[PDB]
């Protein structure tokens, strides 16, 4: 019964502040391979791929089966839903997941306007 | 009476572009169509040195080279002498995308391919443009009829330096130039490997082994 636990589920932040989003693979004998982050503006199912760089710092902790996104200098435009996606390491134990991914429940972020 | 002999030679030309970089590669080889094995020697004619992983090209460089059992109609061998063509989409896990086509003909004991290959949106620091791929993992292609032609779908993955994988969704349409007996749904198991290369992959030796099989016993 594998799940990615994503925290925080919902958050309100002031502009110029920072947010860390954490995703952890729980209740699994599988390991993390590739990791990806997506943004959905309110409504849009169109996914904007957040690359490591600029205001986005993407880190992975393979031993803890966790990965995180840190956003700096938050804007009102950053408002919306953040999604994490991971693929599974190839191994005999998780062989039928070797082409599959798993996503977190998502983070809904509201950035309150400042000045 | 079969025009497909136990040994057939191969001559091909690929023209393409990956992330804007143009190239031409020519090929000659030989294989055993009824044993599903083939070796190719490939040479870069324009665009050397290639700035991208050679492995993204290798499945573009002929299902005529497939060991088919007698109880599965062989779409590809029936297609000769006139021949067939395929069109393929390849969607990688990092939103890299390729499209490829091949027109396959025959003269005497030799197959002729004209291949077009186009790839785009490969991230500059991903495994394709940084050349971090090692090989394609063995695969199983699902073969099925739609719109009177043969479709192939296969989950593919490149092993990367460091033991990770780089996944791709392959979808192919195979179109014979004449009416043939269409098969029921079946699978093709593949292994592809670069046997040898020079430093910049200007010269590549490439081997494929493909065999067809049922996933379920025929209808009773």
Resolution of this model in Å is 2.0
Structural domain contains residue B26: yes
At A5 the three-state DSSP class reads: strand
Residue B1 forms part of a structural domain: no
Domain of residue B90: give its range: 8-213
Beta carbons of A87 and B123 less than 8 Å apart: no
What Cα–Cα distance (Å) separates residue A19 from each residue in A71, B165, B195?
Answer: 5, 30, 49
For the sheet containing A66-71, what is the strand order?
A3-7, A19-26, A66-71, A56-61
Residues B165, A87: C-beta atoms closer than 8 Å:
yes
Contact check, Cβ <8 Å, B167/A99: yes
- Inside any domain, residue B40: yes
CB of B152 closer than 8 Å to CB of B143:
yes
Contact yes or no for A96/A106 (Cβ under 8 A): no
Distances (CA, A) of B8 to A110, B4, B64: 65, 7, 10
- Rounded Cα gap, residues B122 and B17, in angstroms: 12
Q: In three state form, how does the secondary structure of chain B look?
A: CCCCCCCEEEEEEEEEEECCEEEEEEEEEEEECCCCEEEEEEEEEECCCCCCCHHHHHHHCCCCCCECCCCCCCHHHHCCCCCEEEEEEEEECCCCEEEEEEEEEEECCEEEEEEEEEEECCCCCCCCCCCCEEEECCEEEEEEEECCEEEEEEEEEEEECCCCEEEEEEEEEEEECCCCCCCCCEEEEEEEEEEEECCCCCEEEEEEEEEEECCCCCCC
Q: Give me the number of domains chain B comprises.
A: 1
First CA to last CA across chain B, in angstroms? 32
- Distance, CA of B209 to CA of B55 (rounded, Å): 16
Name chain B contacts of A99, Cβ cutoff 8 Å: 155, 157, 167
Task: Please tell me the distance from the alpha carbon of residue B53 to that of residue B194, in angstroms, as a whole number.
Answer: 12
Inter-chain contact A33–B95, Cβ cutoff 8 Å?
A: no
Q: How far is B164 from chain A (nearest CA, A)?
A: 6
Strand spans (E) along A41-91: 48-49, 56-61, 66-71, 80-88
CATH number at residue B179: 2.40.155.10
In-domain check, residue B220: no
Tokens 């086509």 -> residue: B101
| Whole-Å CA distances, B108 to B7, B12, B41, B62 | 11, 15, 20, 17
Q: Report if residue B57 sits inside a domain.
A: yes
Number of domains in chain A: 1
Secondary element (H or E) of residue A17: none
Reduce the DSSP state of residue A96 to 3 states and report it.
helix
Quote the domain boundaries for residue A51: 3-112
Position B138 in a domain: yes
Q: How was this one solved? A: X-ray
Tell me, yes or no, if A98 comes closer than 8 A to chain B by beta carbon. yes
| Closest by CA position to A43, among listed A79, A12, A75 | A79
- Torsion (CA) B90, B94, B95, B97 in degrees, nearest 10: -30
CA of A79 vs chain B CAs: smallest distance (Å): 24
Contact A51 B95 (CB under 8 A): no
The CATH number that applies at residue A51 is 2.60.40.10
Residue B144 located in a structural domain: yes
For B85, what's the count of Cα atoms within 13 Å in the CB-facing half-sphere? 9
Q: Which residue is listed with tokens 């497939």?
A: B66
Does residue B27 form part of some domain? yes
A51 contacts chain B (CB < 8 A): yes
Buried (b) or exposed (e) across A3-20, using 16+ Cβ within 10 A?
ebebeeeeeebeeeeebe
CB of A24 within 8 A of CB of A81?
no
């Amino acid at each position: 019964t594998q799940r990615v636990e994503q925290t925080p589920t919902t958050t309100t932040k002031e502009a110029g502040e920072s947010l860390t989003i954490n995703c952890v693979l729980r209740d699994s004998s599988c390991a993390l391979d590739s990791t990806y982050w997506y943004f959905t503006k309110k409504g849009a199912t169109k996914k904007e791929s957040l690359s490591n760089g600029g205001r986005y710092a993407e880190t992975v902790n393979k031993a803890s089966k966790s990965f995180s996104l840190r956003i700096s200098d938050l804007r009102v435009e950053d408002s919306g839903t953040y999604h994490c996606k991971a693929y599974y390491s190839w191994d005999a134990n998780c062989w039928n997941l070797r082409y599959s991914y798993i996503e977190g429940g998502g983070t809904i972020l509201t950035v309150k306007p400042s000045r | 009476a079969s025009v497909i002999k136990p040994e057939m030679k191969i001559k091909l030309r690929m023209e393409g572009a990956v992330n804007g970089h143009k190239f031409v590669i020519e090929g000659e080889g030989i294989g055993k169509p009824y044993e599903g094995t083939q070796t190719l020697d490939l040479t870069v004619k324009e665009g050397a040195p290639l700035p991208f992983s050679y492995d993204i090209l290798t499945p573009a460089f002929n299902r005529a080279f497939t060991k088919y059992p007698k109880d599965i109609p062989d779409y590809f061998k029936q297609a000769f002498p006139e021949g067939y063509s395929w069109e393929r989409s390849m969607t990688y896990e990092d939103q890299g995308i390729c499209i490829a086509t091949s027109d396959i003909t025959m003269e005497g004991d030799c197959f002729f391919y004209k291949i077009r290959f186009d790839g785009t949106n490969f991230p500059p620091n991903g495994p394709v443009m940084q050349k971090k791929t090692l090989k394609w993992e063995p695969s199983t292609e699902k073969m099925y009829v739609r719109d009177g032609v043969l479709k192939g779908d296969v989950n593919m993955a490149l092993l990367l330096e460091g033991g990770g994988h780089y996944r791709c969704d392959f979808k192919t349409t195979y179109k014979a130039k004449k009416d043939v007996r269409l098969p029921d749904a079946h699978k093709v198991d593949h292994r592809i490997e670069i046997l040898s290369h020079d430093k910049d992959y200007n010269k590549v030796r490439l081997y494929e082994h493909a065999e067809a099989r049922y996933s379920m016993l025929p209808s009773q």
